[PDB]
Design a protein around this nucleic acid. Sequence first.
RNA 1: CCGUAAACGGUCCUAAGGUAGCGAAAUUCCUUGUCGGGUAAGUUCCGACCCGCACGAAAGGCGCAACGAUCUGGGCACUGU
RNA 2: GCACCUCGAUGUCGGCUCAUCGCAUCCUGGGGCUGUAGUCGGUCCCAAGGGUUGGGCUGUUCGCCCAUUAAAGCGGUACG
RNA 3: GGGGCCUUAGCUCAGGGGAGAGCGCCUGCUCGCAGGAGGUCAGCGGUUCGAUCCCGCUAGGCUCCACCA
RNA 4: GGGGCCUUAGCUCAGCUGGGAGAGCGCCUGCUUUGCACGCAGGAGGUCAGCGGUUCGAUCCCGCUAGGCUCCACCA
Lengths: 558, 138
Amino acid sequence: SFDGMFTYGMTHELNEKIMGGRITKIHQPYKHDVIFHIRAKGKNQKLLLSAHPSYSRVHITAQAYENPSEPPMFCMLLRKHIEGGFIEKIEQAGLDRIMIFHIKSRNEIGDETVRKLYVEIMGRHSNIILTDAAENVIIDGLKHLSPSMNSYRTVLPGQDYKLPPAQDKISPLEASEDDILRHLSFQEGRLDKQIVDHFSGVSPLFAKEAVHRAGLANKVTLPKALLALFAEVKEHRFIPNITTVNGKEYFYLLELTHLKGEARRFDSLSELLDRFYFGKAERDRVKQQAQDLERFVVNERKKNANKIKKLEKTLEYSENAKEFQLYGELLTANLYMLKKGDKQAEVINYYDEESPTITIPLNPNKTPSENAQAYFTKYQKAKNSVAVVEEQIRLAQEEIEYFDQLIQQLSSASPRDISEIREELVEGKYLRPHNPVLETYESTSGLTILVGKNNRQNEYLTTRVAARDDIWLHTKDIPGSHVVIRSSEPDEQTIMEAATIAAYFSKAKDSSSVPVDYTKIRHVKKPNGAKPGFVTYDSQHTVFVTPDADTVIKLKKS
Amino acid sequence: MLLPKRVKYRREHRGKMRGRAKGGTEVHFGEFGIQALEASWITNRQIEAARIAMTRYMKRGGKVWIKIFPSKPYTAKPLEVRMGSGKGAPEGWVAVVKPGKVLFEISGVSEEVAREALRLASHKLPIKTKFVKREEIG
RNA sequence: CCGUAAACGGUCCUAAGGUAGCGAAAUUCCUUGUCGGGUAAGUUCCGACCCGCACGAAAGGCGCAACGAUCUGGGCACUGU
RNA sequence: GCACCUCGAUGUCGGCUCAUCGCAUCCUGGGGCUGUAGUCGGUCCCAAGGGUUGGGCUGUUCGCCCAUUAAAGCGGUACG
RNA sequence: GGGGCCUUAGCUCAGGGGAGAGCGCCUGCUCGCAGGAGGUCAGCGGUUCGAUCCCGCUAGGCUCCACCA
RNA sequence: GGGGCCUUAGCUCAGCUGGGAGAGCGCCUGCUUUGCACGCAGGAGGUCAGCGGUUCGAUCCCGCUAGGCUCCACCA
């Protein structure tokens, strides 16, 4: 993955791309992602420094990281200390996953003092720490750590910065083959793990790729393959690509011979990291910002399912109550003797020619007639239950359909979209408490495509925005986004592209050839008094599309 | 809850209640009504209580005509203070009701429904009441 | 004043906005603050939390053996209190 | 609230001692209605005859708590 | 409870002829620029031709008192 | 004695005026993490203080029993 060799390649690319330059804007739109607006030679650049627990990365992004919320205090101190300055050089601290940024920043009083910004990408131990490069005390850190919790390398403002524990490994690059083979000491076959815990900044993916490039593991066969790979990495020779075998993805700066799969080679690492985290980063963000809403909706869906099962239990208690009513009628037609303490009295069949075995009803000590009358009352309550529980089952399936749709719209939604879901639910009273912005796309033929991600956006889009003869698209019998094309005539290619966008923004995102329907927006209506977000339609046409991400990324307008 | 939304003066003299009713003596909108026999200030809270007490028991029937309106404000000095040092703040609104005046008017129901509704209204009022009806000489 | 997890960031104002050490105090209205000890029961007392209306460094701050016809709590013995 | 009596003096809180009076009655006595099965209860009558506690905290009345009791009643008498 | 000062952009504050800064968000331009979203100027009602600007009141936020038996 | 608010997982607490029980901390299971006790999903735990009435379902509405805070006046 983004190992020491990858950092070596990332430092080389950043030295090639952003040399000198000016950091005009510093934005921190999320908890772990920091955006630097580098004005380098030529055009503007957008450097991303991410310290996610699983998705931490450093690359030059190109998409628009929207929702610039109110900035946290680390971002404010970055704009106080770093903005207006220049970048001297970008170098790596050896072969470990440590990024050093040399910032020639002018101070706020007018003079110049160089600042060193340290970026560490260690998975869940990732952090961004800024030092003043003369005394090397920590001015601020992205994650603040205590002297007790993570006692080594305490990150506090004013505390002298300390480096991450040494791994006790040799430098893998420029290392002689003799050196490399005089310390791994292969005995029983832990080869990849030996490369991992003996060789600086090596992912297990590079070890498993090296043991496949060696072919048959051997005393000299393995070492020669590893030396060749390290020499290529040092020569800056890189072939960035994306390979996968089933669904879950992998990326590297070198071509993969092992774990053969669909291999999508990239031009540079910037487009590679833009295409890779394109879905995962967005998914981990609306999950981390709206976990309470989705937890509430899933819990309420479980409540409704348990409610339906316990209502079907009362629907069986309906048939149970009829037998009790019949027993009460039999007791009534015979209650003229043995009134005192009446129970297990044999009853002669009053109905049918069956003459079924004498029954022996047991009654409590109220009155011989009030027990049969109590049975008859239970029967009246049972038939009123037959009415009301069927009404409640109908309401519960309507609620489950709406909540499954809300799960779908929250699962495929962006930061702003999930917040708009929040507002919608609080309005619904479900959550205890103006021409909005939407998402737009441009087709191949220049036709504008509007996609509504939330039901509050969807009802406004369907009833205010789009005019007549606009083709409206939705996935057949599966919840999805509502896609409308604002042109009088839709080209077949436009319809295909909008159907792929609607299939991508659906519950069938990880499906193939998912059904989609398209019709004019004049043919959609909604009932009054029902749940909002319910749109029904008639006279529609069906086409089959495959929800691939490439087409959606290509069709962006912004 | 009846009150004027704007007044010419917020503080007025309390006035006098001598003599009979100047107007509103005869029932001429509804069929039955309450005729006042004594004079006192009627607070709009009492008017609201009497109106709800009539309207609830007349859930099916005609509307109620409220012939009195609390146009005169009364001032209430805050408690535990010395006498004088300026007139106090206005607290509420009362209607100056003289004997002989018609208070509430009902038409469109039966006789006993109207009598019981007027009795329930009269038990909320601070004045002696009587039952009157329209006279057609005429 | 407003945020952000003492400390840092934005703004007004001044000469500058309380450092160390103490803290419900001979200082705390709320208030008999909360917890624990002591008693069967403790608006007093003791030890901590800071939530210090309105502690604070020679109008000195925090501790301190010995000392006091000093003040405030708790025990043994002793008794007509 | 007012300032009628007292500024050529009407000693003001809380306790101790001694009490007395009115029930709008805390218990004890006699009853009605109870959604009063019995015990225990709830509400409203008639009834002042008698009795209505020992402590910890705080100057405290009051109040909280401990242990009882048939109950640990409200007030007036220059807040006796 | 009684005097005095304010309620103005998301935050902090200036301010009878029709109202603004710094920070927070954008816009193209390679340590600074020239522009835009957001203002019931806390609300009501009177004087005139118009009120943030003058006034009588309601809620709110600070400051000083609430003493003698 | 007089009014009010609550008793909900081991702990701190929401649950909108009856439509079918949860957040955080806490205890386990599995994944992941080169490394600094920095991550994720999935499980339990509740007769909603105890009992019995109402209706088709009651923490919610009702009656009857255990409990805890508030709320009540001095004074010279």
